[PDB]
Amino acid sequence: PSGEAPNQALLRILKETEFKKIKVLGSGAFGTVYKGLWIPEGEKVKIPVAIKELREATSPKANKEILDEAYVMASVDNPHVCRLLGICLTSTVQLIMQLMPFGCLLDYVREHKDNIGSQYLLNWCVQIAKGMNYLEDRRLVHRDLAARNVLVKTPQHVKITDFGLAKLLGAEEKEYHAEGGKVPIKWMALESILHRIYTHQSDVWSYGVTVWELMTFGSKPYDGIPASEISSILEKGERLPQPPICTIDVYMIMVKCWMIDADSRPKFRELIIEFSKMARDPQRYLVIQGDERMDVVDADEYLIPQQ
Ligand SMILES: *CCC(=O)Nc1cc(-n2c(=O)ccc3cnc4ccc(-c5cn[nH]c5)cc4c32)ccc1C
């Protein structure tokens, strides 16, 4: 049948003795994530990594959901999307991921805005868009996109994460239709909210929202607003306000994402190019005051195999 190449993504399973969890960066009701060093058996190289230990799965269906989340995470191989290093099937499943010290992107902008250069913002937007498109190329829908779900290895480099929501697409199907689950409203495209329908075009809407957050240095969208309204207002046609920084050229794009009709909103591939175009000259596009002024362990990416 289809000529598509076999996907040889390899899922490594790890003994607990293989890694240790030094401190815990974050604790989640869904899961706990630990700062940890994973040392592969054999090679005396320590890879700093982050471990997520998820809550026990009460039901098999939950069990399946993890496997898929793992399945994709292992599968993806791009710079701006973080691959899953390995899994160990302990009673409480533990997922091993590359460790990004700076942490949540949303968190970073909030704490580094003053030092937060305009040029960086254009680049991140490029980087994020670059990642999502790859996801689009894989027929993968990232159900949840937010600043929160983007992690910074460094200010220079950022990659996507937190895919549990994300679902793969049957070739026949253009769109993926959800069943009721906890969802954060502000990011979701109306089509998703009203009809529990997701498509990459759905993702873009959220992606645009992420940019808004970047532009605003983490200001929370629809701040102080109930989830329920959100369906109503957009139907209303209200949209997130322009970033003070943004040139209409930029804020304009973000608006385009929020267009009610999915097809009308820009395809991701487009976004990378356009933003990249801005990136060559951020200064014209983004107006930031004082803009001009603005040991024994090997990292995994270095770790990754070379011909
Ligand atoms: C915006 C909310 C957020 O970022 N939470 C969060 C941050 C985490 N975190 C951190 O707080 C400090 C350092 C740090 C370094 N590397 C990572 C790597 C991966 C994650 C992560 C979180 N969720 N999925 C992956 C976090 C990291 C760091 C850690 C967890 C959370 C939830």
Swiss-Prot record:
Record annotation: effect of changing residue 302 to F: 50% decrease in interaction with PIK3C2B. 65% decrease in interaction with PIK3C2B. Abolishes interaction with PIK3C2B
Domain Protein kinase: start-end pairs: 19-286
Annotated tissue distribution: Ubiquitously expressed. Isoform 2 is also expressed in ovarian cancers.
Impact when changing residue 16 to G: Found in a lung cancer sample; constitutively activated kinase with higher levels of basal autophosphorylation; more sensitive to gefitinib than wild-type
Region annotated Important for dimerization, phosphorylation and activation, chain positions: 1-11
Known outcome of mutating residue 12 to A: Abolishes phosphorylation
Stated consequence of mutating residue 16 to A: Found in a lung cancer sample; more sensitive to gefitinib than wild-type
Residues carrying Phosphotyrosine: 176, 302
Reported effect, residue 13 to A: Abolishes phosphorylation
Binding site for ATP: 25-33, 52, 97-98, 162
Annotated phenotype, changing residue 52 to A/M: Abolishes kinase activity
Effect of substituting residue 94 to R: Found in a lung cancer sample
Chain positions with N6-(2-hydroxyisobutyryl)lysine modification: 52
Crosslink site: Glycyl lysine isopeptide (Lys-Gly) (interchain with G-Cter in ubiquitin): 23, 44, 61, 64, 174, 236, 267, 277
Record note on modification: Phosphorylated on Tyr residues in response to EGF. Dephosphorylation by PTPRJ prevents endocytosis and stabilizes the receptor at the plasma membrane. Dephosphorylated by PTPN1 and PTPN2.
Disorder association: Lung cancer: A common malignancy affecting tissues of the lung. The most common form of lung cancer is non-small cell lung cancer (NSCLC) that can be divided into 3 major histologic subtypes: squamous cell carcinoma, adenocarcinoma, and large cell lung cancer. NSCLC is often diagnosed at an advanced stage and has a poor prognosis.
Similarity remark: Belongs to the protein kinase superfamily. Tyr protein kinase family. EGF receptor subfamily.
Protein name (database record): Epidermal growth factor receptor
Lineage: Eukaryota, Metazoa, Chordata, Craniata, Vertebrata
